[PDB]
Amino acid sequence: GPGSMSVTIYGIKNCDTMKKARIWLEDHGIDYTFHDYKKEGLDAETLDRFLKTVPWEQLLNRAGTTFRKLPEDVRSNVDAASARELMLAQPSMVKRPVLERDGKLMVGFKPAQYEAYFKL
């Protein structure tokens, strides 16, 4: 059971989740390409492509410090423009891990869930 194709994963290096993802996938016997937000090169084109693939609401963590950074008014008055600027300016907050396959982008899932799901 060979495999010509391969799965590519995007994210950062300064994160525990990322490590858990690469390890889990690696253990399962799947090859995942580790790509850093800065490694791939974040630009206007990339940002647009991402924002077009997924909603800005589900593109950046909200239960973190990034979202807590802005006030109550802004936190509730979030717009596409602001979001896009936040991703292009500080993509390190972008959701992760991230799976890229045929363009379609997917958000990383927890270990307990992934197992409980894939489990028979």
120 noted as active-site residue: no
Long-range CB pairs of 12-17, under 8 A, 24+ apart, other chains included: 12/36, 12/37, 12/92, 12/96, 14/92, 15/96, 17/96, 17/97, 17/108
CB 37 within 8 A of CB 92: yes
Out of 6, 13, 15, 19, the active site residue is 15
| Experimental technique of record | NMR
What is the secondary structure of the chain as a DSSP string? ---SS-EEEEE-SS-HHHHHHHHHHHHHT--EEEEEHHHH---HHHHHHHHHHS-GGGTB-SSSHHHHHS-HHHHHS--HHHHHHHHHH-GGGB-SSEEEETTEEEE---HHHHHHHH--
Total domain count, the chain: 1
Does residue 98 contact residue 21 with C-beta atoms inside 8 Å? no
Rounded to 5°, angle at Cα 70 from 64 and 75 = 85
Please list, residue by residue across 30-54, b when 16 or more beta carbons sit within 10 angstroms of its beta carbon and e when fewer do.
eebebbbbeeeebeeebbeebbeee
The encoded tokens of residue 33 equal 């390409």
Q: What tokens were used for 115?
A: 């197992």
Query: What is the CATH number for 68?
Result: 3.40.30.10
Number of Cβ within 10 Å of residue 109's Cβ equals 14
Alpha carbons 95 and 19: distance in angstroms, whole number: 14
Domain that holds residue 1: 1-120
